Amino acid sequence: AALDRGNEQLAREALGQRQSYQSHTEALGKSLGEQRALVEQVRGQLQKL
């Protein structure tokens, strides 16, 4: 709804603004894929001992 008045310029700034946050979200998303599987393996060790 930013440019509903016809000010298409504001749209690029908002979209350019989010790409900074989009990169961060993807960075954490992948980082939480590796750690999720690793600890579960560790939990097996404790239950074994």
Binding site: A11, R12, L15, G16, Q19
Partner: protein, 43 residues
């Protein structure tokens, strides 16, 4: 100060200009795809 600036740079080289040139190339469609789709999302 300048010594430490380059010394830290060698220990972890920065990305090549091609990487930055392509990184902007990839970002070009990211905004355009959203911006182009934005016109097609409300029309």
């Amino acid at each position: 100060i300048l010594e430490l600036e380059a010394e830290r740079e060698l220990l972890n080289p920065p990305p090549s200009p091609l990487d930055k040139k392509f990184e902007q190339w990839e970002e070009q469609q990211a905004v355009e795809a959203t911006l182009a789709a934005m016109k097609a999302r409300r029309s």
